[PDB]
């Protein structure tokens, strides 16, 4: 994907880490897999790390997510033969400004 | 690279004036002061002056204040020096040198050296091959030669086989004989190679636009 | 000037001014120097390396592995148009892009023992090709590694083949690494391909308080 | 002026040993806590070269060069001495204009006594068509001192030595003998007796005019 916009673009993707070689086979046919992502600045090749882990929300596999910023005339290259959690939607950074992530337990008040 | 290419060797009638040039290349002309050094033939180094290109400020030695004049051509990326009304005194070699930083700096990149000869004499060589005696042979190795006699002014370049032979070669310094220079060269090859091998002596004298070749022919006897 | 610290230390051909630089007081680098990594890629822990520099006044460059000693590999074709010298394709000067010779890339085992009295900064690299084809064309062997060993250092790099956008014409990537070799320690390289070998390393002669000043300026004053 | 005086003037040191050249400044060359002395190397037949800046730090210069000193006197120490170290070495101060240099110190390498490879040459035919020139090379020898004699028919000149060769540490010598055609054609045997410490008896090479 070639970012044709005028803004930086935030792209998210992921890799799936299965429980065993069996689950590996059931989901993606191929037994040894990789995910390579390429950018002007980014270069990575992820290999899924199969292990047996405790169940969290019923699942014992794990998903690992990654992100990068794709500059305005740059392109991102995915190549994978399995365990790939693919981007469908990305985020255009439209307005950069001074903001914050406030940790609070409260909710809106309709005030100003 | 930091190369400093300077002017070619020069001859001046006593009382006249010279203007040797030094062409800068490989760095930013305007960031460093350029200087000139005089070396009285094989003796001691003397500081002449300095000039900073970017605005043309000069800094002279007491000794040379009068006779010297540093100038700079910014578009040309070139530093010039000018010596006015010369004497035998000024016959020596002049180095165009880049000094690193300011008043308290070291000269890191030295140029080749423009060598000036001050004499009323006219521009004048003659080349003679040196084949060994007809009945004598130096054992495992044969020494061959080339003789350059009666020329002015310095210098001359001596090569063997257009330069491809660079091994057993000695080119001796010139000497003054009846107010002319004279020097000799000695190529040394294995006894088997000669006279089978083409041994040619290539001599060049720029000052007269002369280039000569002499082939060493064994003693016709 | 227009060189970056990487460009300087790796020896970008456009950075010949700095082949043998004298002792310095401080270091000046532009914000966004043009002459960085002529062949595209990364310099690992680069910032940590700039920091080390800023605590340093004098590097003496020394030949640690002679280019001439590569008898059974090609140390002459490791050259790219991305790294032009005098208009001709070239490469980083302190580091050697070893390429297969006679359709063979024998396993390399070079070792260097720092016999100096100083810490020594050693740089090397790995090449990440575009495809299995390029892999084969350059180093005969299809699956390769580079292992480096030190008293403290232990790594084994495997080239990560992928298709990446062209940067300076090149779509492959080179990844560079460094380590400090202590005075009686030795560094062990073993590789069967994609190895970008050190030729020159840097003796840390004078450690002192210095800095890398980011400035756009270039004055003969004190 | 800060007069710089180097000592000794000429130094001959055995190969693989230690050369120790001194410098002495008339007044100090030493403020800001650093010494503003510099050492320069002039290998024969070429421009000087920068070795040491501010008296102690090396500029691509091998460690064999030890810059040392402070204040009024310093010392360039070359150790171990190698073959390609024949040169004249200069110290120059930058502490105070006008920049002043030392006299300079010429370094010579002591090596194995080699014998002169003599070879005598008759004048060219092209030259003779008015002057005669008997040339006689004496290449590759050591020690420096040699003694050429010319003999014409038993009865007894321009000489020229090269600098000690940077590569083998051996001198060479030319020895031309110029005459006019007529002065020349009035004799027969031309000899060239070199007397070295190598041979206890004179090395000779001669040639006879008519052969
Ligand atoms: C991502 O998409 C971009 C647009 O499709 C692309 O940029 C394009 O790059 C080409 C060369 O590869 C330029 O070609 C010509 O550009 C101008 C004409 O306006 C002139 O200077 C020359 O004639 C030159 O040859 C395109 O103009 C340029 N297009 C745009 C709209 O900027 C990127 O390079 C793509 N990036 C990746 C990383 O693949
Ligand atoms: C690097 O080289 C040196 C010298 O060749 C090694 O130091 C020697 O170590 C032994 C014991 O292994 C001592 O008994 C010697 O006297 C040492 N020699 C010197 C000159 O110091 C050193 O250990 C080598 N390092 C590696 C990592 O191989």
Q: Are strands A43-46 and A35-38 parallel, antiparallel or unpaired?
A: antiparallel
Interface contact B55, partner C, CB < 8 A: no
Tokens of C112: 């260097």
Asked if residue D181 lies in contact with residue D126, where contact means CB atoms within 8 angstroms, the answer is no
Percent composition of chain B: helix, strand, coil (DSSP 3-state, to 5): 5, 50, 45
Percent composition of chain A: helix, strand, coil (DSSP 3-state, to 5): 5, 35, 60
Q: Does D98 share its domain with D161?
A: no
Tokens of A28: 């993606």
Chain D positions contacting chain C at CB under 8 Å are 53, 57-60
Nearest alpha carbon to residue B93 among B116, B64, B118, B60: B116
B106 with D162: Cβ contact below 8 A: no
Tokens of C156: 């084994």
Cis peptide before D143 (omega within 30 of 0): yes
In terms of residues, how long is chain D? 211
Neighbours of C30 (CB within 10 A): 16
The yes/no answer on whether domain B1-120 falls in CATH 3.30.70.20 is no
- Please check whether residue C158 lies inside any domain of the structure: yes
Q: What are the start-end ranges of the E strands in D43-152? A: 49-53, 57-58, 65-70, 73-78, 88-93, 100-101, 105-110, 117-121, 131-141, 148-152
d(CA B186, CA A73): 68
Looking at the CA of A74, name the nearest ligand.
Answer: 1
Neighbours of B10 (CB within 10 A): 17
Q: Does D7 share its domain with D93?
A: yes
How many CA atoms are closer than 13 Å to the CA of A94, on its beta-carbon side? Answer: 2
Tokens of C79: 């050259």
**Under 8 Å CB-to-CB from B157, ≥6 apart: which residues?**
B203, B204
Q: Does D179 share its domain with D198?
A: yes
Beta bridge partners of B73: B78
Asked if residue B22 lies in contact with residue B6, where contact means CB atoms within 8 angstroms, the answer is yes
Centroid of chain to Cα D84: 12
In terms of residues, how long is chain A? 112
B108 with C22: Cβ contact below 8 A: yes
Do chain D and chain A touch with ≥3 beta carbon pairs under 8 Å? no
Q: Does D6 share its domain with D85?
A: yes
User: Last residue of some domain: D111, D140, D174?
Assistant: D111
Task: Report chain B's terminal Cα–Cα distance, integer Å.
Answer: 55
- Domain count for chain C: 1
- Please check whether residue C102 lies inside any domain of the structure: yes
Q: What are the start-end ranges of the E strands in chain C? A: 27-29, 41-43, 56-63, 80-84, 89-90, 95-97, 108-113, 120-128, 146-149, 154-157, 173-181, 186-191, 195-198, 200-207, 212-214
Report domain extents, chain B. 1-120, 121-221
Q: Does D107 share its domain with D122?
A: no
d(CA D153, CA D158): 20
Any long-range contacts for B191-196 (C-beta under 8 Å, 24+ apart)? B191/B137, B191/B138, B191/B139, B191/B140, B191/B141, B191/B142, B193/B142, B194/B142, B194/B144, B194/B218
Assigned CATH class of B121-221: mainly beta
| Ligand 2 center to C109 CA (angstroms) | 20
d(CA C162, CA A25): 24
Beta bridge partners of B171: B185
d(CA D2, CA D74): 14
Asked if residue C70 lies in contact with residue C211, where contact means CB atoms within 8 angstroms, the answer is no
Return left, alpha or beta for C220; rule: phi > 0 is left, psi -120 to 50 is alpha, else beta.
left
Alpha-carbon dihedral sign for residues C154, C158, C163, C166: positive
Give the DSSP letter of residue C64: S
Neighbours of B84 (CB within 10 A): 14
Data resolution in angstroms? 7.0
Q: Does D136 share its domain with D206?
A: yes
Q: Does D102 share its domain with D10?
A: yes
Tokens of D25: 């400044």
The CATH number for D182's domain is 2.60.40.10
Asked if residue B2 lies in contact with residue B98, where contact means CB atoms within 8 angstroms, the answer is yes
Give the DSSP letter of residue C45: T
**Under 8 Å CB-to-CB from B85, ≥6 apart: which residues?**
B15, B16, B17, B67
Planar angle of CA D79, D83, D86, nearest 5 degrees: 85
The CATH number for C212's domain is 3.90.209.20
Give the residue numbers spanning the domain of C135: 1-217
| Ligand 1 center to A73 CA (angstroms) | 8
Nearest alpha carbon to residue B102 among B63, B59, B156, B44: B59
Alpha carbon nearest to ligand 1 atom 3, residue: A73
Nearest alpha carbon to residue C175 among A44, A46, A13, A73: A44
Helix (H, G, I), strand (E, B) or coil at A22: helix
Helix (H, G, I), strand (E, B) or coil at B123: coil
Kindly tell me the burial class for residue C120, based on how many C-beta atoms sit within 10 Å of its own C-beta (0-12, 13-18, 19 or more): buried
Tokens of A18: 């299965």
In the block, residue with structure tokens 């030319």: D174
Q: Which residues of D176-191 are buried (b: 16+ CB within 10 A; e: fewer)?
A: bbbbeeeebeeeeebb
Sequence-ordered alpha helix ranges (H) in chain D: 125-128, 181-184
Distance from CA of C84 to the nearest CA of B (A): 14
Q: Are strands D88-93 and D73-78 parallel, antiparallel or unpaired?
A: unpaired
Q: Does D89 share its domain with D10?
A: yes
Distance from CA of C21 to the nearest CA of D (A): 8
Asked if residue B67 lies in contact with residue B83, where contact means CB atoms within 8 angstroms, the answer is yes
Q: Does D120 share its domain with D196?
A: yes
d(CA C45, CA C59): 19
Residue D126 backbone phi and psi in degrees, to 5: -65, -35
Give the DSSP letter of residue C211: -
In the block, residue with structure tokens 């990068």: A68
**Under 8 Å CB-to-CB from D203, ≥6 apart: which residues?**
D115, D116, D118, D193, D194, D195, D196
**Under 8 Å CB-to-CB from C195, ≥6 apart: which residues?**
C98, C108, C124, C125, C126, C127, C146, C189
Asked if residue D178 lies in contact with residue D133, where contact means CB atoms within 8 angstroms, the answer is yes
User: Last residue of some domain: D111, D134, D152?
Assistant: D111
Asked if residue B121 lies in contact with residue B179, where contact means CB atoms within 8 angstroms, the answer is yes
Asked if residue B103 lies in contact with residue B47, where contact means CB atoms within 8 angstroms, the answer is no
B135 with D211: Cβ contact below 8 A: yes
| Ligand 1 center to C167 CA (angstroms) | 13
d(CA D159, CA D141): 15
In terms of residues, how long is chain C? 222
Distance from CA of D125 to the nearest CA of B (A): 9
User: Last residue of some domain: D111, D136, D165?
Assistant: D111
Kindly tell me the burial class for residue D125, based on how many C-beta atoms sit within 10 Å of its own C-beta (0-12, 13-18, 19 or more): exposed
Ligand 1 within 6 A of A74 CB?
Answer: yes
Chain C environment of B108 (Cβ under 8 Å): 22
d(CA C90, CA C70): 18
Planar angle of CA B107, B88, B14, nearest 5 degrees: 115
Tokens of D69: 């000193």
Q: Does D53 share its domain with D35?
A: yes
Residue C8 backbone phi and psi in degrees, to 5: -65, -55
- Please check whether residue C222 lies inside any domain of the structure: no
Any long-range contacts for C81-84 (C-beta under 8 Å, 24+ apart)? C81/C169, C82/C38, C82/C39, C82/C40, C82/C168, C82/C169, C82/C170, C83/C12, C83/C13, C83/C38, C83/C39, C84/C13, C84/C14, C84/C38
Ligand 2 proximal residues by C-beta, below 6 Å: C 113, 115, 184-186
**Under 8 Å CB-to-CB from A22, ≥6 apart: which residues?**
none
d(CA D115, CA D147): 13
Which technique?
A: X-ray
Nearest alpha carbon to residue B133 among B69, B52, B220, B196: B220
Q: Does D103 share its domain with D117?
A: no
- Domain count for chain D: 2
d(CA D92, CA D54): 10
Question: A38, A39, A78: best mutation site toward chain C, by most C Cβ within 10 Å?
Answer: A38
Three-state secondary structure of B148-213: EEEECCCCCEEEEHHHCECCCCEECCCEEECCEEEEEEEEEEECCCCCCCCCEEEEEEHHHCEEEE
Return left, alpha or beta for D72; rule: phi > 0 is left, psi -120 to 50 is alpha, else beta.
alpha
Tokens of D147: 């003694």
d(CA D86, CA B131): 32
Helix (H, G, I), strand (E, B) or coil at A27: helix
Neighbours of B30 (CB within 10 A): 16
Neighbours of B121 (CB within 10 A): 13
Please state the atom number of ligand 2 nearest to the C-alpha of residue C113. 1
| Ligand 2 center to C184 CA (angstroms) | 7
Chain A environment of C163 (Cβ under 8 Å): 38, 77, 79
Q: Does D7 share its domain with D107?
A: yes
d(CA B146, CA D58): 42
Cis peptide before D8 (omega within 30 of 0): yes
Residue of B nearest to C220 (CA): B102
Give the residue numbers spanning the domain of D202: 112-211
Residue B139 backbone phi and psi in degrees, to 5: -45, -85
């Amino acid at each position: 994907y070639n970012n044709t916009n005028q803004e930086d673009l935030l792209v998210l993707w992921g890799i799936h880490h299965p429980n065993d070689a069996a689950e590996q086979t059931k989901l993606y046919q191929n037994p040894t897999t990789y995910i390579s992502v390429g950018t002007s600045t980014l270069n990575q090749r992820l290999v899924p790390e199969i292990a047996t882990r405790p169940k969290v929300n019923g699942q014992s596999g794990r998903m690992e997510f990654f992100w990068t910023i794709l500059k305005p005339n740059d392109a991102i290259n995915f190549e994978s033969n399995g365990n790939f959690i693919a981007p469908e939607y990305a985020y255009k950074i439209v307005k950069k400004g001074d903001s914050a992530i406030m940790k609070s337990e409260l909710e809106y008040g309709n005030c100003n | 690279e930091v190369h400093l290419q300077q002017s070619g060797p020069e001859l001046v009638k006593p009382g006249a004036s010279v203007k040797m040039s030094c062409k800068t290349s490989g760095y930013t002309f305007t960031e460093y002061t350029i200087h000139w050094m005089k070396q009285s033939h094989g003796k001691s180094l003397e500081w002449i002056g300095g000039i900073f290109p970017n605005n043309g400020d000069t800094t002279y030695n007491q000794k040379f204040k009068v006779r010297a004049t540093l100038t700079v051509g910014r578009s040309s990326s070139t530093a010039y020096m000018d010596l006015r009304s010369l004497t035998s005194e000024d016959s020596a070699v002049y180095y165009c040198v880049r000094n690193y930083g300011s008043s308290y700096g070291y000269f890191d990149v030295w140029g080749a050296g423009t060598t000036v000869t001050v004499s009323s004499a006219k521009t004048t060589p003659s080349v003679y091959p040196l084949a060994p005696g007809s009945a004598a042979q130096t054992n495992s190795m044969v020494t061959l030669g080339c003789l350059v006699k009666g020329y002015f002014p310095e210098p001359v370049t001596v090569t063997w086989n257009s330069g491809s032979l660079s091994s057993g070669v000695h080119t001796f310094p010139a000497v003054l004989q009846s107010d002319l220079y004279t020097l000799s060269s000695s190529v040394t090859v294995p006894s088997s190679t000669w006279p089978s091998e083409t041994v040619t002596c290539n001599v060049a004298h720029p000052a007269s636009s002369t280039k000569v070749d002499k082939k060493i022919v064994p003693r016709d006897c | 000037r227009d060189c970056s610290v990487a460009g300087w230390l790796l020896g970008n051909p456009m950075c010949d001014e700095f082949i043998n630089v004298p002792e310095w007081s401080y270091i000046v680098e532009k914000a966004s120097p043009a002459n960085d990594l002529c062949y595209p890629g990364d310099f690992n822990d680069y910032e940590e390396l700039k920091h080390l520099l800023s605590r340093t006044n004098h590097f003496e460059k020394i030949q640690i592995i002679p280019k001439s000693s590569w008898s059974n590999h090609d140390a002459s074709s490791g050259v790219s148009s991305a790294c032009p010298y005098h208009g001709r394709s070239s490469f980083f000067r302190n580091v050697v892009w070893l390429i297969k010779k006679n359709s063979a890339y024998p396993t390399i085992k070079r070792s260097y023992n720092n016999t100096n009295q100083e810490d020594l900064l050693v740089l090397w690299g790995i090449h990440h090709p575009n495809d299995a084809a390029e892999q084969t064309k350059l180093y005969q062997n299809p699956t390769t590694y580079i292992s480096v060993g030190t008293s403290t250092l232990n790594q084994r790099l495997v080239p990560e083949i992928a298709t990446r956008p062209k940067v300076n014409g090149q779509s492959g990537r080179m990844e560079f690494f460094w380590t400090i070799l202590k005075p009686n320690d030795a560094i062990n390289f073993e590789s069967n391909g994609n190895f970008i070998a050190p030729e020159y390393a840097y003796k840390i002669v004078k450690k002192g308080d210095s800095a890398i000043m980011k400035s756009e300026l270039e004055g003969n004053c004190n | 002026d800060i007069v710089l005086t180097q000592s000794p003037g000429s130094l001959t040191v055995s190969l693989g040993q230690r050369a120790t050249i001194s410098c002495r400044a008339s007044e100090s060359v030493d403020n800001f806590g650093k010494s503003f002395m510099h050492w320069y190397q002039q290998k024969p037949g070429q421009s000087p070269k920068l070795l040491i800046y501010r008296a102690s730090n090396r500029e691509g210069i091998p460690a064999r060069f030890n810059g040392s000193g402070s204040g009024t006197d310093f010392a360039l120490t070359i150790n171990p001495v190698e073959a390609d170290d024949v040169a004249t070495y200069f110290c120059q101060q930058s502490n105070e204009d006008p920049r002043t240099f030392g006299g300079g110190t010429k370094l010579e390498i002591k090596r194995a006594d080699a014998a002169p490879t003599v070879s005598i040459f008759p004048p060219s035919s092209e030259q003779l068509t008015g002057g005669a020139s008997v040339v006689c090379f004496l290449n590759n020898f050591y020690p420096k001192d040699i003694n050429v004699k010319w003999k014409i028919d038993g009865s007894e000149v321009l000489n020229s030595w090269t600098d000690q060769d940077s590569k083998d540490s051996t001198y060479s010598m030319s020895s031309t003998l110029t005459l006019t055609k007529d002065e020349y054609e009035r004799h027969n045997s031309y000899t060239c007796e070199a007397t070295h410490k190598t041979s206890t008896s004179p090395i000779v090479k001669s040639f006879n005019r008519n052969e």
